[PDB]
Design an enzyme around this catalytic site. Structure first.
Site, short mmCIF file in Angstrom:
data_model
loop_
_atom_site.label_atom_id
_atom_site.label_comp_id
_atom_site.label_asym_id
_atom_site.label_seq_id
_atom_site.Cartn_x
_atom_site.Cartn_y
_atom_site.Cartn_z
N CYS A 19 -4.02 1.38 7.50
CA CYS A 19 -4.78 0.99 6.31
C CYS A 19 -5.74 2.10 5.90
O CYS A 19 -6.64 2.46 6.66
CB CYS A 19 -5.55 -0.30 6.55
N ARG B 58 -10.13 1.16 4.83
CA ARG B 58 -11.01 0.60 5.85
C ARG B 58 -12.49 0.90 5.66
O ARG B 58 -13.30 0.32 6.40
CB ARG B 58 -10.58 1.04 7.25
N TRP C 74 -7.61 -5.09 -2.67
CA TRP C 74 -7.17 -4.65 -3.98
C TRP C 74 -6.24 -3.46 -3.82
O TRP C 74 -6.24 -2.78 -2.79
CB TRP C 74 -8.34 -4.25 -4.87
N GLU D 151 0.75 2.31 -4.60
CA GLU D 151 1.58 1.22 -4.07
C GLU D 151 2.37 0.57 -5.19
O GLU D 151 3.51 0.17 -5.00
CB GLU D 151 0.70 0.17 -3.39
C1 HEM Z 1 -9.85 -3.54 0.06
C2 HEM Z 1 -9.02 -2.57 -0.30
C3 HEM Z 1 -7.75 -2.20 0.52
C4 HEM Z 1 -7.00 -1.11 0.29
C5 HEM Z 1 -7.28 -0.04 -0.79
C6 HEM Z 1 -5.89 -1.12 1.23
C7 HEM Z 1 -4.90 -0.15 1.33
C8 HEM Z 1 -3.79 -0.17 2.13
C9 HEM Z 1 -2.60 0.65 2.01
C10 HEM Z 1 -2.36 1.74 0.91
C11 HEM Z 1 -1.77 0.30 3.00
C12 HEM Z 1 -0.38 0.89 3.31
C13 HEM Z 1 0.62 0.26 2.34
C14 HEM Z 1 1.80 1.18 2.19
O1 HEM Z 1 1.81 2.27 2.82
O2 HEM Z 1 2.72 0.81 1.41
C15 HEM Z 1 -2.42 -0.74 3.78
C16 HEM Z 1 -1.93 -1.40 4.88
C17 HEM Z 1 -2.61 -2.33 5.64
N1 HEM Z 1 -3.83 -2.92 5.32
FE1 HEM Z 1 -5.12 -2.32 3.90
N2 HEM Z 1 -6.02 -2.25 2.01
C18 HEM Z 1 -7.14 -2.94 1.60
C19 HEM Z 1 -7.56 -4.13 2.16
C20 HEM Z 1 -7.20 -4.63 3.38
C21 HEM Z 1 -7.73 -5.82 4.04
C22 HEM Z 1 -8.82 -6.78 3.48
C23 HEM Z 1 -7.08 -5.93 5.22
C24 HEM Z 1 -7.25 -6.98 6.32
C25 HEM Z 1 -8.34 -7.75 6.44
C26 HEM Z 1 -6.15 -4.82 5.33
C27 HEM Z 1 -5.30 -4.57 6.38
C28 HEM Z 1 -4.16 -3.80 6.33
C29 HEM Z 1 -3.09 -3.77 7.32
C30 HEM Z 1 -3.05 -4.62 8.61
C31 HEM Z 1 -2.16 -2.89 6.90
C32 HEM Z 1 -0.83 -2.52 7.60
C33 HEM Z 1 0.25 -3.33 6.89
C34 HEM Z 1 1.63 -3.12 7.44
O3 HEM Z 1 1.82 -2.26 8.34
O4 HEM Z 1 2.55 -3.83 6.95
N3 HEM Z 1 -6.26 -4.07 4.20
N4 HEM Z 1 -3.63 -1.00 3.20
C1 KMM Z 2 -4.44 -6.23 1.97
C2 KMM Z 2 -3.61 -5.11 1.34
C3 KMM Z 2 -4.20 -4.34 0.35
C4 KMM Z 2 -3.46 -3.32 -0.25
N1 KMM Z 2 -3.98 -2.53 -1.22
N2 KMM Z 2 -2.19 -3.09 0.12
C5 KMM Z 2 -1.57 -3.81 1.06
C6 KMM Z 2 -0.13 -3.41 1.37
C7 KMM Z 2 0.44 -4.01 2.68
C8 KMM Z 2 1.93 -3.78 2.61
C9 KMM Z 2 2.70 -4.51 1.70
F1 KMM Z 2 2.11 -5.44 0.92
C10 KMM Z 2 4.06 -4.28 1.61
F2 KMM Z 2 4.82 -4.98 0.74
C11 KMM Z 2 4.67 -3.32 2.40
C12 KMM Z 2 3.91 -2.59 3.30
C13 KMM Z 2 4.59 -1.55 4.18
C14 KMM Z 2 5.71 -2.20 4.99
C15 KMM Z 2 5.30 -3.55 5.60
N3 KMM Z 2 5.71 -3.76 7.01
C16 KMM Z 2 6.84 -4.69 7.05
C17 KMM Z 2 6.06 -2.48 7.66
C18 KMM Z 2 2.54 -2.82 3.40
F3 KMM Z 2 1.80 -2.10 4.26
C19 KMM Z 2 -2.29 -4.85 1.70
#
Ligand code: HEM
Ligand code: KMM
Ligand code: HEM
Ligand code: KMM
Ligand code: KMM
Ligand code: KMM
Ligand code: GD
Ligand code: GD
Ligand code: GD
Ligand code: GD
Ligand code: ZN
EC number: 1.14.13.39
Lengths: 402, 401
Positions: free
Chosen positions: A106, A109, A278, A283
């Site tokens: 993520c 963070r 958000w 993405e």
């Molecule tokens: C608030 C603004 C946030 C932004 C800008 C953001 C951004 C991102 C991005 C760009 C990714 C990777 C997606 C991809 O590579 O396609 C990601 C993954 C992730 N985010 Fe964040 N996120 C946000 C909020 C959150 C919140 C609130 C949580 C949990 C409480 C979170 C937890 C995670 C997790 C666990 C992943 C890994 C998902 C996976 O491997 O499938 N994020 N996020």
């Molecule tokens: C909370 C939040 C905020 C934000 N801005 N973006 C996200 C994106 C999370 C997320 C997806 F939604 C998705 F469709 C696919 C992926 C990668 C593959 C998923 N896994 C099976 C390997 C991913 F990381 C989450």
């Protein structure tokens, strides 16, 4: 004895002492690195609980106090009498923030400490589940001024089924398979679309039909719930200077809300705990709209731009992708819906890295996922060495409930 | 055997080549360090034997009495002198495999086509400079670039080594300034200081080709001036933005790495410069747009009339893409070989399929194979990879100062 970590844009060097606390084994060995892979109780439940309690009491600057000593003993005895144990709500809040702070893939963070944690642990039915989800969507959307939130449904328990959300996200677009092997709508959602139909949903036929939720209360078949359209805020896509872009008829939704991950805190597992924040613009524009296995608009846009698509050295793909991302950023700003571009998001992740080095001695980071999928080296994270390891509390993948 | 998935297709392979990984990398089960830039007579013999065995295996001559005679010759040589020398064909095979084994190189589809110049009889820094000049001329070939490597004498205990103090054969000067900034390439400020302190009269242009510091064993390093028409350069122009030429940008045709150590069968070659041809993003994105290099992004964006106030205009991404267009166009117009990142990653995908049948895998470093712009628009992005170290190999080595 700790990893040395260099930033190559500045030359700075730090040492990640946090990686010693790594509570789980990853897939790499000294003989080969597998870091690129996408998918790599009694006295065991107990060991995780004590470590979590130590973390909590450190966060409130009361490490070693009498109350710290007491809660450790108190949890230790609730395990023995019952097997499991119950988090105090202040510990649940802290643990949900920690799972976010710990999530290596993520980039968002910087915000981890300002998560709104809704306690749905007293939830009893699917109907109640839907109400909690609607409240989550309403709060997090906030008419476009998006706010990070998580709703945590009851923990997994022996003798009772699991709470589960079948959908991978709360807002998803349907994907209908066509005669010519093409998908009308989002091809990533063809499967969940099948399941919604087989469970009673009257399907549409657009490219952007919002899917119903399939909600599972313990030991129940999943139940279908249509999202009220006033709840699902969407953004029509248009380009600030290419007026024909609006005629593509593209849109995306405001709220990214992951609903299929398992939240683990101190040995306890919450298989339904959807969370939202958000979007980062790449993405939507690069992955969702441009991937060949998603909406795959890149060549269409290129032709409208009158680019030479027969030769790769024109960089027609690169040019069309930047303009799609411009359209997404412009359109969310026009609609007053929170969005961050990949330069801002990665600049803030660098600040997060500085903050965490002070606070914990390092930060788990998955370089291949932190670096955006376009313009990688134009962002500061590309030149930052990173160390990837698993800490708990954590969000985890889990099998589809079907 | 690690399971490797392509996420665009859904195809799976298993990497059985990784089982033979000679060295140990940085990672452990508890933390991955894959993004890190930089991770005995019985020792030499065991590596020598492994390499000699690889050679006869590749020509289908394992067990044959020529294989046995060669193994005996190395045993006798290393017993007598603590080292041994390679045959000419062994050297050529070792140089190709070292390229083929390089996990960070995306251009490895070309690995079987490599010209190998044996310079192991080199005696002096003057002779070394002659050899280097022949390499540049052969490899440049009027702009029809040809991959090549020249190998200087092996290291040995006692005397010093042949070293090329320059990181590449063609490098622009970086001038630490009276007022703090840098004129030219900031990545070459150290080497430019060293050429001044060895009797080079410096210039004051942004693209001054540096002299080569060449060093014979224990004898000191001596400066050498490169002939100006040996070094081919490409002025940068844009196909439709007429003002782009007024920026006075240029780059050189030949990417020629001169600071890496070549290791074959337990022997080590501290001086073995190798060259290929550029992928355009190397010039356009890293060399011209990195903030710690020429850092031209904003100047180009201003000439494009872009809004540099806020990052959400994506002015950085637009300027970078047009710089890469200008590079491709200018090398094509000048008839100098270049490859764009889309074609290079397509060829690396075919390379991965080739190497699966031939060797059971291919060590690849995902973070270096994916291009620095438009990563997910290239086929390598959705391809899982396994990183591991095979020998023969190119390795880093400390600066000679
Ligand atoms: C608030 C603004 C946030 C932004 C800008 C953001 C951004 C991102 C991005 C760009 C990714 C990777 C997606 C991809 O590579 O396609 C990601 C993954 C992730 N985010 Fe964040 N996120 C946000 C909020 C959150 C919140 C609130 C949580 C949990 C409480 C979170 C937890 C995670 C997790 C666990 C992943 C890994 C998902 C996976 O491997 O499938 N994020 N996020
Ligand atoms: C909370 C939040 C905020 C934000 N801005 N973006 C996200 C994106 C999370 C997320 C997806 F939604 C998705 F469709 C696919 C992926 C990668 C593959 C998923 N896994 C099976 C390997 C991913 F990381 C989450
Ligand atoms: C012929 C066309 C070639 C192309 C298109 C090409 C392309 C590349 C690129 C883009 C990189 C990464 C550069 C970076 O990340 O900054 C690289 C790395 C590398 N290549 Fe190649 N190359 C070619 C020829 C060669 C040859 C002839 C050799 C050796 C005989 C070689 C060996 C290596 C090595 C050792 C590295 C790693 C350098 C490092 O880690 O810093 N390549 N190549
Ligand atoms: C190596 C790497 C680095 C990085 N940064 N991102 C990724 C995303 C790859 C990826 C997934 F992770 C995923 F879950 C699903 C898909 C599409 C599946 C197509 N099929 C279901 C129709 C996919 F392409 C990979
Ligand atoms: C033969 C050949 C063909 C081609 N197209 N490109 C190359 C590029 C090799 C190379 C450099 F030359 C360089 F200056 C800098 C780097 C970055 C790593 C810096 N390294 C000290 C850790 C790099 F990878 C070589
Ligand atoms: C993580 C990553 C992935 C990838 N694909 N490429 C890179 C190249 C980065 C990089 C180097 F490797 C390097 F040797 C030197 C510099 C400049 C240093 C100048 N400064 C100390 C005065 C640099 F930026 C990094
Ligand atoms: Gd019922
Ligand atoms: Gd217009
Ligand atoms: Gd000899
Ligand atoms: Gd103008
Ligand atoms: Zn690793």
């Amino acid at each position: 004895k700790f990893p040395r970590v260099k930033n190559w844009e500045v030359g700075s060097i730090t040492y990640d002492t946090l990686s010693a606390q790594a509570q789980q084994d990853g897939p790499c060995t000294p003989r080969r690195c597998l870091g690129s892979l996408v998918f790599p109780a009694p006295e065991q439940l107990l060991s995780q609980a004590r470590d979590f309690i130590n973390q909590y009491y450190s966060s409130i600057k009361r490490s070693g106090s009498q109350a710290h000593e007491q809660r450790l003993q108190e949890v230790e005895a609730e395990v023995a009498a019952t097997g499991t144990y119950q988090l105090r709500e202040s510990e649940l809040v802290f643990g949900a923030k920690q799972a976010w702070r710990n999530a290596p893939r993520c980039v968002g963070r910087i915000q981890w400490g300002k998560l709104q944690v809704f306690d749905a642990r007293d939830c009893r039915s699917a109907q109640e589940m839907f109400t909690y989800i609607c409240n989550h969507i309403k709060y997090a959307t906030n008419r476009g001024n998006l706010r990070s939130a998580i709703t945590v449904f009851p923990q997994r328990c022996p003798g009772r089924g699991d709470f589960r959300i079948w959908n991978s996200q709360l807002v998803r677009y349907a994907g209908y398979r066509q005669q010519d092997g093409s998908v009308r709508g989002d091809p990533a959602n063809v499967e969940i679309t099948e399941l919604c139909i087989q469970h009673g949903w009257t399907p549409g036929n657009g490219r952007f039909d919002v899917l119903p939720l399939l909600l599972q209360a313990p030991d129940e078949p999943p139940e279908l719930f249509l999202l009220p359209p006033e709840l699902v805020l969407e953004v029509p896509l248009e380009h600030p200077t290419l007026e024909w872009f609006a005629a593509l008829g593209l849109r995306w939704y405001a709220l990214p809300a992951v609903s299929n991950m398992l939240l683990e805190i101190g040995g306890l597992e919450f298989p339904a705990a959807p969370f939202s924040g958000w979007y980062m613009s790449t993405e939507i524009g690069t992955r969702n709209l441009c991937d060949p296995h998603r909406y795959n608009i890149l060549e269409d846009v290129a032709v409208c731009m009158d680019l030479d698509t027969r030769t790769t050295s024109s960089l027609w793909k690169d040019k069309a992708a930047v303009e799609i991302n411009v359209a997404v950023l412009h359109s969310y700003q026009l609609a007053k819906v929170t969005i961050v571009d990949h330069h801002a998001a990665t600049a803030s992740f660098m600040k997060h890295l500085e903050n965490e080095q002070k606070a914990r001695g390092g930060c788990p980071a998955d370089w291949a996922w932190i670096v955006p999928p376009i313009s990688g080296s134009l962002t500061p994270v590309f030149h930052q060495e990173m160390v990837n390891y698993f800490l708990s509390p954590a969000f985890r993948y889990q099998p589809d409930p079907w």
